[PDB]
Subunit: 279 residues, 3 copies
């Protein structure tokens, strides 16, 4: 029953300053249990509504924040020459055996790093990469080498996160939607989507696309400006817009922006290659 | 030997649907032998032609593809607090001891990750980074921190792959050339070269240069446009080209492109610093 | 200890560095080891800021780092996947560190973090999976986010945020060159890169994808002043581009990348306004 669990987390978070490494009992159990529900993908930090809008369940963010006060800093073994690390967030794979990996049915390449409470769906491929607390990585998604899925981020099904891609983490403010990459998006290498922006489903981002909360996204044919959202089935590449003249009157510098070069549909995505879409 | 090895692999590749983790015998031995030849650099995914063009040895890609079918997913130890990974590609350094590292004569910094079948030449420095299956990293090359040498990529001698540089992997389609970086190239930090593009020898890429299959590469002085290839001894920086206007009457956005600002030669390259070449 | 005599020995040993090797022990080894422990503890640092605000290099600490390369052999370092090894000659900072050492040092080291010995990491720093190289200085309360790199001898001021994929470029030789310096309270947005000894002055905010090297043009949008290798205090910086010369065919040429200071604020504005507003 999620209803009771949320109630405790809401009230315990209100008294969060009294929570520490000595707190046990119902508060400790509720937070832990919630992080296991997250780790399994049974709950998620944000859920998509019928309208297509995403709504945050704040008590899950509060549970993650509360886990920082509950768990102590500890020696974590496994470093070079038998040295240690010093942290208070366990790996997702703590106590995982072959049977556990067979059940989860995803591939974790040596170098992959995943914190507990992050959900990894079946048929995902984790290259050497980092997945932070509360993230959700759905069916068949590729997380390529040195990619980062930040806290609470949502990665949809059959997403390709290319090498060096950063999906920015979003914990506070509590009301903020985390960064969201919807189903069937291609995120080109070195791209970055942060600060709770959403890439609507079927979109294709070329290499070097940066999308933050205050990034101008312009449809090259329409003239429309989007903030924090890329509409469905968009092909997006990096560009620049003119700036204000310099104080001496000389032509001003251009400023970076994201450029929507195509808006397609589902049939176009299934029929046309990524490279053709970007050409 | 090589003729018969190629034949065994290609016959098995045509029968790849009947191949799985229970397949042993000559097919297993041939695939393992082919990947060991790749690992020591005795064969490589590509051959340079007389034309100056590179073509793929498709049977070697087939060996790599078969090894996915032959090897089981398994526990691989060494994670934090004794946790494991779950993969079916062994490390290049499996069973390597001091003597293996001394014979190989390259430097492997803790954090470096190299899968078996990747060739790493003498005097290479692997900072924390990742080198994928079938890659070739030639003599004296620097692989800097969080760089990636993708599957089958060919990196020439005395190349500097700066921090966070990605050389994109190319396995299928079988006929597609991998990404190639020829001798004495410098690739500045955060740059990316993917999808089988080739950076010819002695070229210098500034920071943040992206080179993909459909990237316009323009010589600013010549006006010449290149696609998928940077000509020899080019100095390349990130830039932009004008776009079409919006219907509302506003000028359209510029779009990213790669800009050749200089084309030099071996003598110019050897005497002049990277920063001077990029300064103008 | 007496720093003056230690400097004298390091200086003399470096003049005869060709006679220094992996067999060398005695006073020279102890002196180099001591200086790197001083570097690791932050009791000494590769550069110190002067009264005028200029940074001055302590060349003898660079010489000590260089000598430790000659003193220590290439060796097996354990901890790789499936019990495999690395092959390097620089010890981890965390060699022999226990809970008491971590509790005393009072910073947080997340599994995946990599730090070489001689790098100082101050209290309340958070090291995500990342790399900190020799002689670096990471001051109080700084966040080093995932796949960031703090290059050799780099100086990171207090309460700096190095976002994901940020590169702070290393500077060892030339001995006289100042390393890369990031002053107090700076924000460095994701995928940004600052290399080749550039300095970002106190309180500045760099957007995503900002690359600053020695030869990157930085233009002040508000004054029009052009800076090279230095960003003034409390600058807001984003990536941009400047126009080029026409092509020989008569068409407009490509733009070339540059860094743009779009606003310059102060300490009070910085404390009151969020990073996101500063970038709008
Ligand atoms: Cl753990
Ligand atoms: Cl296949
Ligand atoms: Cl292995
Ligand atoms: Cl060590």
């Amino acid at each position: 029953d999620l209803t009771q669990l949320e109630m405790i987390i809401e009230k315990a978070f209100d008294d969060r300053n009294s929570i520490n490494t000595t707190t046990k009992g119902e508060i400790l159990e509720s937070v832990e249990h919630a992080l296991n529900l997250l780790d399994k993908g049974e709950v998620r930090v944000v859920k998509r509504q019928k309208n297509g809008k995403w709504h945050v369940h704040q008590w899950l963010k509060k549970a993650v924040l509360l886990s920082f006060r509950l768990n102590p800093m500890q020696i974590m073994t496994g470093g070079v020459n038998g040295t240690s690390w010093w942290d208070k967030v366990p790996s997702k794979f703590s106590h995982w055996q072959e049977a556990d990996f067979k059940k989860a049915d995803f591939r974790s390449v040596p170098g992959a790093i995943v914190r507990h409470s992050a959900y990894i769906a079946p048929n995902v491929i984790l290259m050497p990469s980092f997945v932070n607390l509360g993230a959700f990585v759905d069916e068949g998604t590729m997380v390529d080498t040195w990619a980062t899925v930040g806290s609470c981020a949502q990665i949809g099904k059959h997403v390709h996160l290319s090498g060096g891609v950063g999906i920015g983490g979003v914990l506070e403010p509590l009301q903020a939607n985390p960064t969201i990459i919807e189903d069937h998006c291609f995120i080109g290498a070195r791209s970055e989507v942060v600060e709770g922006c959403i890439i609507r489903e079927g979109s294709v981002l070329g290499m070097g696309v940066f999308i933050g909360k205050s990034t101008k996204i312009i449809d090259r044919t329409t003239g429309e400006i989007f903030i924090g959202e890329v509409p469905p089935y968009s092909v997006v590449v990096p560009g620049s817009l003119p700036g204000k003249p310099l104080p001496n009157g000389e032509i001003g510098p251009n400023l970076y922006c994201a450029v929507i070069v195509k808006r397609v549909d589902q049939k176009t995505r299934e029929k046309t290659s990524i490279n053709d879409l970007l050409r």
